[PDB]
Design an enzyme around this catalytic site. Sequence first.
Site, PDB file in Angstrom:
ATOM      1  N   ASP A  68     -20.180   7.981  19.700  1.00  0.00           N
ATOM      2  CA  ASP A  68     -18.740   8.262  19.584  1.00  0.00           C
ATOM      3  C   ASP A  68     -18.391   9.474  18.704  1.00  0.00           C
ATOM      4  OD1 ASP A  68     -17.664   6.336  21.279  1.00  0.00           O
ATOM      5  OD2 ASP A  68     -17.085   4.940  19.698  1.00  0.00           O
TER       6      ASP A  68
ATOM      7  N   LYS B 109     -20.637   4.542  11.175  1.00  0.00           N
ATOM      8  CA  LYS B 109     -20.974   3.205  10.688  1.00  0.00           C
ATOM      9  C   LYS B 109     -22.263   2.731  11.380  1.00  0.00           C
ATOM     10  CE  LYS B 109     -17.760   1.517  14.137  1.00  0.00           C
ATOM     11  NZ  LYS B 109     -16.630   0.622  14.481  1.00  0.00           N
TER      12      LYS B 109
ATOM     13  N   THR C 161     -15.929  -1.964   9.375  1.00  0.00           N
ATOM     14  CA  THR C 161     -15.423  -0.577   9.344  1.00  0.00           C
ATOM     15  C   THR C 161     -14.965  -0.155   7.942  1.00  0.00           C
ATOM     16  OG1 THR C 161     -13.128  -1.106   9.959  1.00  0.00           O
ATOM     17  CG2 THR C 161     -14.653  -0.652  11.765  1.00  0.00           C
TER      18      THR C 161
ATOM     19  N   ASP D 283     -15.568   7.862  11.989  1.00  0.00           N
ATOM     20  CA  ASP D 283     -15.862   6.433  12.121  1.00  0.00           C
ATOM     21  C   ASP D 283     -17.358   6.179  12.147  1.00  0.00           C
ATOM     22  OD1 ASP D 283     -13.052   5.928  12.333  1.00  0.00           O
ATOM     23  OD2 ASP D 283     -13.141   6.492  14.446  1.00  0.00           O
TER      24      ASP D 283
ATOM     25  N   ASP E 174     -28.187 -19.043   9.489  1.00  0.00           N
ATOM     26  CA  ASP E 174     -28.858 -20.153   8.813  1.00  0.00           C
ATOM     27  C   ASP E 174     -30.371 -19.838   8.684  1.00  0.00           C
ATOM     28  OD1 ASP E 174     -29.444 -22.728   7.843  1.00  0.00           O
ATOM     29  OD2 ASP E 174     -29.349 -23.655   9.818  1.00  0.00           O
TER      30      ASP E 174
ATOM     31  N   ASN F 269     -22.571   2.421  15.237  1.00  0.00           N
ATOM     32  CA  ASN F 269     -22.629   3.678  15.980  1.00  0.00           C
ATOM     33  C   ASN F 269     -23.968   4.383  15.792  1.00  0.00           C
ATOM     34  OD1 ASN F 269     -20.059   3.620  17.153  1.00  0.00           O
ATOM     35  ND2 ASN F 269     -19.108   4.668  15.415  1.00  0.00           N
TER      36      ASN F 269
HETATM   37  C1  LIG Z   1     -18.837   7.661  24.693  1.00  0.00           C
HETATM   38  C2  LIG Z   1     -19.641   6.433  25.039  1.00  0.00           C
HETATM   39  C3  LIG Z   1     -20.024   6.176  26.352  1.00  0.00           C
HETATM   40  C4  LIG Z   1     -20.687   5.008  26.688  1.00  0.00           C
HETATM   41  C5  LIG Z   1     -20.979   4.071  25.710  1.00  0.00           C
HETATM   42  C6  LIG Z   1     -20.623   4.312  24.381  1.00  0.00           C
HETATM   43  C7  LIG Z   1     -20.869   3.307  23.322  1.00  0.00           C
HETATM   44  N1  LIG Z   1     -19.870   3.106  22.385  1.00  0.00           N
HETATM   45  C8  LIG Z   1     -20.193   2.157  21.539  1.00  0.00           C
HETATM   46  N2  LIG Z   1     -19.412   1.763  20.528  1.00  0.00           N
HETATM   47  S1  LIG Z   1     -21.753   1.430  21.801  1.00  0.00           S
HETATM   48  C9  LIG Z   1     -21.983   2.514  23.165  1.00  0.00           C
HETATM   49  C10 LIG Z   1     -23.274   2.472  23.868  1.00  0.00           C
HETATM   50  C11 LIG Z   1     -23.905   3.610  24.380  1.00  0.00           C
HETATM   51  C12 LIG Z   1     -25.099   3.460  25.018  1.00  0.00           C
HETATM   52  C13 LIG Z   1     -25.669   2.178  25.133  1.00  0.00           C
HETATM   53  N3  LIG Z   1     -26.882   2.015  25.764  1.00  0.00           N
HETATM   54  C14 LIG Z   1     -27.388   0.787  25.818  1.00  0.00           C
HETATM   55  C15 LIG Z   1     -26.783  -0.341  25.266  1.00  0.00           C
HETATM   56  C16 LIG Z   1     -25.573  -0.200  24.648  1.00  0.00           C
HETATM   57  C17 LIG Z   1     -24.985   1.078  24.574  1.00  0.00           C
HETATM   58  N4  LIG Z   1     -23.770   1.244  23.945  1.00  0.00           N
HETATM   59  C18 LIG Z   1     -19.967   5.499  24.061  1.00  0.00           C
END
Ligand SMILES: Cc1cccc(-c2nc(N)sc2-c2ccc3ncccc3n2)c1
Length: 427
Positions: free
Chosen positions: A149, A131, A168, A129, A371, A134
């Site tokens: 992820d 993208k 996606t 996944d 916009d 991520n």
């Molecule tokens: C396995 C795992 C654990 C904790 C978060 C994520 C995670 N998954 C996403 N799809 S965005 C994200 C993440 C990570 C770090 C971040 N730090 C500052 C702002 C947004 C954030 N978001 C994944």
Amino acid sequence: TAIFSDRYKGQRVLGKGSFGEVILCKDKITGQECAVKVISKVKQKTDKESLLREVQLLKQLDHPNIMKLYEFFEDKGYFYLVGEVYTGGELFDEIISRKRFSEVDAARIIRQVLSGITYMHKNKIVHRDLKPENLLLESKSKANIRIIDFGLSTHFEASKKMKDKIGTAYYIAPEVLHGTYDEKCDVWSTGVILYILLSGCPPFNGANEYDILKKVEKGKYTFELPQWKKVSESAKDLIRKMLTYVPSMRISARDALDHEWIQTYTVPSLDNAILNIRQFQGTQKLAQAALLYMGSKLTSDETKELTAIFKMDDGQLDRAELIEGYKELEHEVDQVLDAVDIEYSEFVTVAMDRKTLLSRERLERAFRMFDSDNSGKISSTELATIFGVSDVDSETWKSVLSEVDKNNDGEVDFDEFQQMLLKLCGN
Ligand SMILES: Cc1cccc(-c2nc(N)sc2-c2ccc3ncccc3n2)c1
């Protein structure tokens, strides 16, 4: 045995995530800040023993372009993935803020993504996944990229909701669609991201999710756009090897790092590509914002359930009873009562209107950003693209548009666009 709440306390929301919400949390002893994804038991693609052994391996891996995973907790209703905080935002949100973007800037980005992938494939981990959402930056500047992820996204069942599916279909490898896939699917997804960095347009595109997936399954694309004339043949040659249809003939992540393009470029500005990635990102973000507005309107369910709780009753209730009413479904109660000072009807009305105005404000920021010429309106052609990405039927939104304003003349301002979304979620 170990409980999440005995170690961490929530501070503030960080954003949306795949399979769950992301909260900024703080260790109650050391003060260490952490990003915690909360996954509501989202079906399980594998048994509990397979997830435990994957998480155990993932915690021991270490690479500067891979997100660091610290802990994993589980209770009767949720899984908690605790990892490192990256404050630079999403990669594409940083690219659209720049004045210039060249082939060197694109190669520097793709070398980091490929370094992360090569390291994870050596450890038998597949992303699937990959993208732009991520790909987070450590700081908001032209910064190290962290892939999120990696190896986790595949242990959970993919959400069928369009709010989670947006952005996606462009990146999924054709073999993932038919079921037989290996680590080569991550090279395809990086090849798609590279095509967008150099042209600002996806190689596989369509009016809706299914039309994109039909283009992906056929696997045919071209470099026949005016933007591509200003790009080197070494970049086009790497894209061809990365977007090779049969996975056994597709280049490896390691062989893509050793490609002449990555070695040479890691510088004329790709102006048309920046204008297109800005339009692409603006469209994606307004479709997401539109779905989250409709989602928040149906949730605010909360107003109906809170009224049946507040059973608890003169048409009035004490401060402590209102705190008990919220806790069943302290500082947040005082902010509502500040504008009033009380009746429980006026409290729910002031509390609901406060959540409505803030929901309208997040949608408005996305509308204003879309916009780009500050015209104050979006055309019927632009609505068709936005509703195409958000999967709202053409006849349905066109009927709703006629109901809101019979003399719309093919354009809508923010208020009218907001009115259309209310009618598209039973309001
Ligand atoms: C396995 C795992 C654990 C904790 C978060 C994520 C995670 N998954 C996403 N799809 S965005 C994200 C993440 C990570 C770090 C971040 N730090 C500052 C702002 C947004 C954030 N978001 C994944």
